[PDB]
């Protein structure tokens, strides 16, 4: 037995049998003898590697294993880690290191002070002090990433470690289970029941950990038991509730003053599975309406600690909601009434309007499609127009780090081969993760990649207009041909200029079993 | 006066008037009122932004200014910082931060613990404690990046700072000069002279800081003064010596046993402007030949401290070399004789060999072309076949981080518009920095981008053989059409399958003033 055999035994028994990577010489001794029951997914750039792994871990509900090259490979993946942090993504990131005797002299490919490199975007990082501790360190990595609050971890491994003999006692590691006890106490449950049942007009607010914990159906039961509306917490990264349910109200605005206005008539706000709150725009005002109280249920002690208001309970979301639904009384206030349907937009005679594209998607897509969205000026219209009825149907970068979309679509589609993934990606956002197209071609992962091509960084032009700034450089992205780029990376590509051409292209893509890129020139104002 | 007006005044007076960036909302208050005498170079991904700035700083010999978005933009640029670290590149990296009152709550776009993010790849990192300290902190960043050993620094700026009034006393900052005194003392100089003059058979070994300090001509003078051969230090990132000068001996192998074998006959080794040594492959053996001594001249205290052998002198390389050339006595030993030229490789009639491509480059390229190389299995052949006569003629990623090549070619070409830049890039390496093609097209930066397309991560096949690994996944890169990708980003693109087709494409590219991508299918 070697450090190598012991390590692959640990990965197999813990279920980490898909490796997302881009290889280098320090990693070859790990990749040696790669087992026939494991799968390796090559990305051409590490931002795409990490984002594929992120999508895979989130959609599968299991940890994902990554293998990168030394400091430059780790570095190229670091933007993608910002999103993985706020999505509570359990990524086990390994990077290969020089031989131990060559690290201090700073030989070429030595990753200097390796554990510091990924900080502060990892929950744990190490470089084992000896070859013999590597298998236990890898066990520690997997169980740190997969415990609440879940998140990325990092391990740097000198390449001469793998061939060394495994130590006595290593046989205990592969079978280890780490379980998290997160049910409320009887007193804690009583407090939630008393406060909710006593409220005049409560409201529900739901974040990405409602989807991550598979609590969507429980959230519907909760809303119905208290006859209350349900919103998505601001800066939404996942969809936690069926969007045409009559209690649904949309996504809250990412603004201090905006949330206290939207929720002004409610005496009690219950936030589940989000921070309080991922505000974005500067909009000073009241954190809460006068007389309103807030309750917060979260899996993350740091979310509970940092909130500017409310009483928090930190624990297991699905067990907490199940207990709460059981313990609450029925209510006979009237049921909330549904939001009105979105009207078609006016025909203006220029390029296709995003609203039009979305109406077509809502008509032709399967009702359990999965959407991966990274198109920053069209978010409001998408949520209004594209129904998302089932869990696990939406992914948007949780840190707002662009380059998530194309790679995450490939990883999500790999995790959920029985559903169809449709990416809705801007011309700007596409270029941060463009080589994911190639991985989709090579492995025949049949994402429908829709590129909305408006010629600009539209969301930034909007924000610039708001600040009366007209002199900022760098906001336009002319001269891009995504059909040529798609074909370059091996993906069947088509340009759709009208509503009829777009419908035909989407229909034909959905009917097939290959990736397709659909380039859609769109209106921007 | 505002923090904004004072900061642009500092950048202007210090000479940082080109901004390399990718914008975001936290940066819009900085980019507001961008001055007419500044230039903004947009990159579509931050790895390319930082690589362009890196090339520009190295080729211009001046610091370069970067503006990135928050933590995700900073993160996307961090692979490029590995290279900037080992090339001693003076990059001033700014990243926009949320409004100060929204940082601790972790609002969307808050960069948490920002100064820790780029570590350990920056020599100084800060987030100012108040708006009034932003101008002085920017000055500190500039003067930290540009003092020996030069390197990247990082400043995180909350976006509500820019509009605030500038503090009293700010007017002293823009004019500040920071000079480095780095000449050897009389005793230090005499020790080098005494030792070198007493040696039986000295040898010279030169690294990237010889090119960086503009000491190439002095290195030739020194070699000639001691009638000694000259090598490039291993893991070469720049070219410090004219490669057809008769004392030139090529690049040392990146191997412990290799160096002591190559240099076996020399009693004294003088290493200038490189670490001792950037070994790569694991080839254990003797650090030095028995009886040999090593002298080291470096601009970097860390290089001096970490070396496993030798006596080091840390200071100003160009000033130290000039003092040494002046002080050395006459030497009567015969001059070294030139290396024999490379033999032709016989064409087997099918896909082109890289050696053939390099012979055509050597025939047709201007004799002061600049090469940006990131083609990992073809480095030895390149150095054997493509003459580099002038300073500032070669750039290869100093940390080996791929994605340097396409972006750095663009930045070098921007720094040196009077010379012509030829990028020599593999099919694997191109994809880590591919959006640099777009910036070349948009700004009409006329790089000749040559893509060597062998279908594989060729150098990893070599290392797999060395390490005795035969079943590793992920070594092949089939199914890439770089003419389609080039055209997609706006660059005129042509495929060249034969020696004649490549000559014609290279000649036409060189005769024009637009960027061109030339895709060349090659044998491994
Ligand atoms: C890595 C990274 N760099 C820069 C930004 C800043 N950013 C925010 S929105 C945006 C524009 C995206 O444009 P596009 O995807 O074309 O969508 P549109 O706004 O045009 O709808 C940019 C560049 C970011 N969020 N992430
Ligand atoms: C960012 C990064 N990721 C991975 C590697 C590992 N790496 C070393 S050489 C190499 C292959 C480069 O292939 P190519 O540019 O096609 O050149 P060839 O070896 O085929 O001549 C790779 C992937 C690296 N050095 N940098
Ligand atoms: Na756009
Ligand atoms: Na290659």
TrEMBL record, chain B:
Thiamine diphosphate binds at residues 376-377, 400, 402, 428-429, 454, 458-459. Residues 190-324 form the Thiamine pyrophosphate enzyme central domain. Its EC number is 4.1.1.7. It is an enzyme of class 4 (lyase). Residues 381-520 form the Thiamine pyrophosphate enzyme TPP-binding domain. Keywords: Lyase, Thiamine pyrophosphate. Residues 3-109 form the Thiamine pyrophosphate enzyme N-terminal TPP-binding domain. This is Benzoylformate decarboxylase. It comes from Pseudomonas fluorescens (strain ATCC BAA-477 / NRRL B-23932 / Pf-5).
């Amino acid at each position: 037995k070697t450090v190598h055999s012991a390590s692959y035994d640990i990965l197999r028994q813990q279920g980490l049998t898909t490796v997302f990577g881009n290889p280098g010489s320090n990693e070859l001794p790990f990749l040696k003898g790669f087992p026939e029951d494991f799968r390796y997914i090559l990305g051409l750039h590490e931002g795409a590697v990490v984002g594929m792994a992120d999508g895979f871990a989130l959609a599968s509900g299991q940890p994902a294993f990554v293998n990168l090259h030394a400091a430059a490979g780790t570095g190229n993946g670091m933007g993608a880690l910002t999103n993985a942090w706020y999505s509570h993504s359990p990524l086990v990131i390994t990077a290969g290191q020089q031989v131990r005797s060559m690290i201090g002299v700073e030989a070429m490919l030595a990753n200097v002070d390796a554990p510091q490199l990924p900080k502060p975007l990892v929950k744990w990082s190490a470089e084992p002090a000896c070859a013999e501790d590597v298998p236990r360190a890898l066990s520690q990595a997997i169980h740190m990433a997969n415990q609440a609050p879940k998140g990325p971890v990092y391990l740097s491994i000198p390449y001469d470690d793998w061939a060394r003999p495994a130590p006595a006692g290593v046989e205990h590691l592969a079978r280890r289970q780490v379980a998290t006890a997160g049910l409320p106490s009887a007193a804690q449950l009583r407090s939630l029941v008393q406060r909710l049942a006593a409220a005049r007009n409560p409201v529900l607010v739901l974040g990405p950990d409602v989807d991550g914990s598979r609590s969507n159906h429980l959230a519907v039961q909760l809303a119905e038991k208290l006859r209350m509306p349900a919103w998505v917490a601001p800066s939404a990264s996942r969809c936690p509730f069926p969007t045409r349910h009559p209690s649904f109200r949309g996504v809250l605005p990412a603004a201090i003053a905006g949330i206290s206005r939207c929720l002004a008539d409610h005496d009690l706000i219950l936030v589940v599975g989000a921070p309080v709150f991922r505000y974005h725009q500067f909009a000073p005002g009241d954190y809460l309406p006068a007389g309103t109280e807030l309750l917060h249920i979260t899996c993350d002690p740091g979310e509970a600690a940092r909130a500017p208001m409310g009483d928090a309970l930190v624990g297991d979301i699905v067990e907490t909601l199940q207990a709460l639904v059981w313990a609450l009384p029925d209510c006979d206030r009237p049921q909330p009434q549904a939001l009105p349907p979105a009207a078609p937009v006016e025909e203006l005679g220029g390029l296709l309007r995003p609203e039009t594209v979305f109406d077509v998607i809502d008509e032709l897509a399967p009702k359990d499609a999965i959407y991966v969205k990274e198109s920053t000026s069209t978010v409001g219209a998408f949520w209004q127009r594209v129904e998302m009825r089932e869990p696990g149907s939406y992914y948007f970068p949780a840190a707002g780090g662009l380059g998530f979309g194309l790679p995450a679509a490939v990883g999500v589609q790999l995790a959920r081969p029985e559903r169809r993934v449709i990416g809705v990606i801007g011309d700007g956002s596409a270029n941060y993760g463009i080589t994911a197209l190639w991985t989709a071609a090579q492995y025949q992962i049949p994402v429908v990649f829709i590129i909305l091509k408006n010629g600009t960084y539209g969301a930034l032009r909007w924000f610039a207009g708001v600040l009366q700034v007209s002199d900022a450089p760098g906001l336009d992205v002319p001269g891009l041909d995504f059909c040529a780029i798609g074909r370059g990376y091996g993906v069947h590509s088509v340009q759709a200029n009208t509503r009829e051409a777009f419908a035909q292209a989407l229909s034909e893509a959905l009917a097939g079993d290959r990736p397709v890129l659909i380039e859609v020139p769109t209106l921007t104002i």
